Symmetry: C3
Subunit: 335 residues, 3 copies
Amino acid sequence: DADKLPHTKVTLVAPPQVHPHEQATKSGPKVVEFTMTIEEKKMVIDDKGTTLQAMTFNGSMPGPTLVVHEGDYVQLTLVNPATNAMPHNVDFHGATGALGGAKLTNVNPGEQATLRFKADRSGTFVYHCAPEGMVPWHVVSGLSGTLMVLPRDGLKDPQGKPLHYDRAYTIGEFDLYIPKGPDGKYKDYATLAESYGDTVQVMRTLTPSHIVFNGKVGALTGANALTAKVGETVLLIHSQANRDTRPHLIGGHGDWVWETGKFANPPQRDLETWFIRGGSAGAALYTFKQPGVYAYLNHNLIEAFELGAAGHIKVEGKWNDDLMKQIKAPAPIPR
Amino acid sequence: DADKLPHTKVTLVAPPQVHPHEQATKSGPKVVEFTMTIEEKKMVIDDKGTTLQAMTFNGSMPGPTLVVHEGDYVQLTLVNPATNAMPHNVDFHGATGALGGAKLTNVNPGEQATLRFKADRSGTFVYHCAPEGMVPWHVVSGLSGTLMVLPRDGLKDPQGKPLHYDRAYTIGEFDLYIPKGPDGKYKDYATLAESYGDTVQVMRTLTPSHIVFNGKVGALTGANALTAKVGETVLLIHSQANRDTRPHLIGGHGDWVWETGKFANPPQRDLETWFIRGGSAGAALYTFKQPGVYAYLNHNLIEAFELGAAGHIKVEGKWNDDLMKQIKAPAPIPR
Amino acid sequence: DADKLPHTKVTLVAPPQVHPHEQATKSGPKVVEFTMTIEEKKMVIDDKGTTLQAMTFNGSMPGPTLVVHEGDYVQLTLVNPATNAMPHNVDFHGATGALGGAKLTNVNPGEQATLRFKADRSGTFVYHCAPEGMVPWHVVSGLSGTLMVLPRDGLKDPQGKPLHYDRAYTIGEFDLYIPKGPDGKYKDYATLAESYGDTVQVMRTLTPSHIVFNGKVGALTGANALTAKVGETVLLIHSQANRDTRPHLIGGHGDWVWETGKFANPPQRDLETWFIRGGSAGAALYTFKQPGVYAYLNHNLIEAFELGAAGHIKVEGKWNDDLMKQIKAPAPIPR
Ligand SMILES: [Cl-]
Ligand SMILES: [Cu+2]
Ligand SMILES: [Cu+2]
Ligand SMILES: [Cu+2]
Ligand SMILES: [Cu+2]
Ligand SMILES: [Cu+2]
Ligand SMILES: [Cu+2]
């Protein structure tokens, strides 16, 4: 009986960070309380000033990552403030019944609701808005995130050996369908509702105009690059709520990867490129061995470099000549 | 010697049902006899009244599912009635040699042929028409289905434990390429051959006009929804002969999934969304824990909700408040 | 210390062949020396006479397959001849650091460089050119190939039983983006640079004009078909540096498949169709049981038969009636 379990509130943090949590824990099942607030906003998505009429959990794309342990209950209050124009709900892929909770969380602007569900399966799971009659529009406008359900004893390799990360990062990849006018330029809409019909038309062609990590071209670059050091293990959580992606770390690997995202299954090792099915989240472990600026990207290189599905990881530390060495620098072809 | 083995005739049933069969059997290898008849027919594929000049096994999309056990021989009589326009054949992915049997089953209208092959590998396999020079057209027009080859001792989890289902369902997903006229309306053809050049032109764009389960938009909805109850285990067989898909059960999971469809390989557990490669069939087991109407869909949500790749499962039984509970119904935000 | 290890030179061979190598070896780690030369060239890619302003490793698409053993070092000299227009480099997915080696191998026309890296992870790995600001263009123009890093003890099934092949074949699949003029005909460029802006425009649509094995429509057909015999085991290495593919052997199977291409992971068996993620190479074993001409293809059948992603394997030997038999040849339906 979940009603008689300990109840704890967790404060969420903005992507690419994940809120503080234990991996292995000695503690028993708890009801973990989260709150999220829908924010509809116009967002600049590229270095030309192209805007999206966006819909977000907590003002960000992706929504924040919620972390519990297997056997815990997730208890979410979803707030849809009167400042919004559309109704919303939430469908958790980690939950069982009522369309993921969508049937029980239909909130019109000015309303809120509270859902509890048992997180009885370990893994990274997508959550997204799913209002009947307009599911794809709400999802592609930015309403998705990840729930991570860790095993109580933490992550394990195929032989049951413990795997540990020093930092988790969360990347949400968003296929965007921005309409154009007769002049060939991207439309700019005064309101969210004005964007609807044209956006649906672009959606039906199945060709995204942009594909971005975390809400914009270059979101995870420059001052906002991910960071690490040699010897550090990172967990990279990657969600795509609508479309397939194929993550790749340039100069690195996926040491252990759950590409389907489910921790009771044995991970795969040494992956160059992995595969996140549209409507899922996956996770990769990597321990950095070389310093430098890595690219983390969708390995359809057109989608990465032309459409925006790429970020950076800046890594400090000592170069290893055993792993890689320049034997002869670029120089004239000998006579 | 396959000639001296027992012979049995099996009567096929229309999708989404699968003909009665044993899972684990004490029986030895048999030659199992099936007959199918190719039916070319004009089919209404959506609610606007759009038609496809279709090609079907037994008048349905997908063709019926054929079930045998590993070690059995499949003996199919393929009939191409005098009233059809085109030559046809059959290519079984479960078979070895002669292009899956296509080379041995070249039937013009007014002809029939009988092929035997050994089903020596367990799994769900695509079969489809493959007439020389005309393969993609015949496949996308509806000519595919599934052969399920069960292990003699039935399905097993990764640790060798027996897995039973109470009901198998078969879903065939079809990417359609319907031409449009200068007015931007879908073309309606008097004959199959009239539709050919225009369809190839759409196919080459690699963008489907429609993507449907079992022959039309909403085919597995309303009175034709799949049904189950709480406590029942269903096997969901999903085929896609031409294009990738990513099945998802909203409010449910894949308890045990063979996404590549081959039963000698350990399945994966707890999947939110799985992946069927174009040119293959996969299988998922799920045991229902909550009542209600579920959606079963391709989790590219545009393909599901805009293009038609979605169905329903109507489930009876008792709601489980432990697995999911509405703690606070949608209500005003406290001022 | 890698500098003190034995050094050997390897002579590469043109695809679809792979240079002579041991599977299991008693040899210890070695620095294995290769040299490749970038060749920019206009290439005829289809029957209609359509050309590509192509960029190639050693004049071929794909580049040749480099084969080492786990724990070896790869030492590549990359030559960019004085007669080329563009700067180049190489990114090995099998390497660790400096963007797969791309940062250390920036060669302008007239220059060369030598890179060493430890091949410490077994599997088939993509390598490709990756010049700053120009990555997708160079890759889709033909600059990719495979590095195969074999385990020292050769290939193993999931139970650890040895798996041996008689011949390895290497297939590179290339999605091409050829611009058209206002007349709807494919453009023919005098220079590589003239093709640039137009190609980027086609790339952004994400719709290939052609998808080819090994550099052109029908490259592995006719006199250039792959060959084999009944009882022979082949390894089929399949690489795709930019886009997903789904390999299928018509009338055959993947007996043991590493679809993510990493040999430390258990392979899967009996696959009808497998999946190569864009940005990876995979590998499949098959032992032939039937004679005949097989088709090896991308099982998006439009991409195979309309766009070019198909080849042939011609197989000699004795027909096996136990596996497949024509019981009744095509004949009039009985009246
Ligand atoms: Cl030929
Ligand atoms: Cu919403
Ligand atoms: Cu969903
Ligand atoms: Cu046909
Ligand atoms: Cu096929
Ligand atoms: Cu280059
Ligand atoms: Cu790469």
